[PDB]
């Protein structure tokens, strides 16, 4: 029977060479994920069909921000293949009320809070 896959938790562990591979570090984890769907939910079972709808990834290549809590991480751990996770790193902090109007995404996952259309 093809059943629901349950992943052992020794896969979700980072060896120290991975901290050289990707820039993240266990001290100071990122607080927010950016999830983008990169696979269709068709030819995939109904639980994955509704977990994508729960996470709000209906349109592929559309970014959503999400909490780095273990409950949401567990929902991601059944659709870890259909998605693409990048940690939302912030050079400047969260936007203020006068700074909400001019922001953008800037893939490589850097939510800049001052977006001008002018070169450097």
């Amino acid at each position: 029977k093809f059943t629901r896959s349950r992943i052992p938790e020794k896969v979700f562990q980072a060896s120290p060479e991975d901290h050289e591979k990707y820039g993240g570090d266990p001290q100071n984890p990122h607080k927010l994920h950016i999830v983008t769907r990169i696979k269709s939910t068709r030819r995939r079972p109904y639980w994955e069909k509704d977990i994508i709808k729960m996470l709000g990834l209906e349109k592929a290549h559309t970014p959503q921000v999400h909490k780095n809590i273990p409950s949401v991480n567990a929902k991601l751990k059944v659709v870890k293949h259909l998605i693409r996770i990048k940690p939302l790193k912030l050079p400047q902090g969260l936007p203020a009320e006068e700074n909400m109007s001019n922001t953008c995404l800037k893939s490589t996952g850097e939510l800049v809070v001052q977006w001008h259309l002018k070169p450097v």
């Binding site: 029977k1 093809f2 992943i7 896969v11 995939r44 293949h81 259909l82």
Partner: protein, 205 residues
């Protein structure tokens, strides 16, 4: 006694309930006898398969007619055939349940030793008629020694450490990295990526 005894077809206590062909008995590695005991050299089985009574007569003839009973001796590792095979009469449609019991087989998995031999010789003495009998078994089989079996296991282990390819079967299938468990089997979490169906793929790490 230094000779393989007569193994009897159709066991003297017969079977009266017709068992289904429980097809786990060919798949994967063996939990049964994979090791040597009171011997030196043997037959390794590189793939699953049933054994009729014909192969039993073939082995009992092809080792005894080419072995000198003053120097070498031989023991089975497999039992007499116990699993019944049900065969209908020929020319019948589908329907009506299973037919009568026809014959009896014994199942051997991969890696289970079949015929073990020892005595006051060396592996090159036995290997001749051993590759004679080994090609006629109904799967891929091989002649092995206690030394060469260990050296082969060292090669199969060293290939697990030598590969530069970062994606093994065990990194992917245990994690279900592509959702590939939809395509794979549940037995590919434990057999490994080596076994496929009946055959055993030895070159695949």
């Amino acid at each position: 006694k230094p000779k393989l005894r007569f193994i009897e077809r159709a066991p003297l206590v017969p079977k009266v309930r017709r068992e289904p062909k429980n097809l786990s008995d060919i798949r994967g590695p063996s939990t049964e006898a994979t090791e040597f005991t009171e011997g030196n050299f043997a037959i390794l089985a590189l793939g699953g398969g049933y054994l009729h009574w014909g192969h039993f007569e073939m082995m009992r003839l092809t080792i005894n007619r080419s072995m000198d009973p003053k120097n070498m001796f031989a023991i089975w590792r497999v039992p007499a055939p116990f699993k019944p095979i049900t065969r209908k009469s020929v020319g019948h449609r589908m329907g009506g349940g299973k037919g009568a019991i026809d014959h009896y087989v014994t199942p051997v998995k991969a890696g289970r030793l079949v015929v073990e031999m020892g005595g006051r010789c060396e592996f090159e003495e036995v290997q001749g008629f051993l590759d004679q009998v080994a090609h006629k078994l109904p799967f891929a089989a091989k002649a092995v020694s206690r030394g060469t079996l260990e050296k082969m296991r060292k090669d199969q282990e060293e290939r697990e450490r030598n590969n530069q390819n970062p994606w093994t079967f065990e990194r992917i299938a245990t994690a279900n990295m592509l959702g590939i468990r939809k395509v794979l089997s549940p037995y590919d979490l434990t057999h490994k990526g080596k076994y496929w169906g009946k055959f055993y793929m030895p070159k695949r790490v």
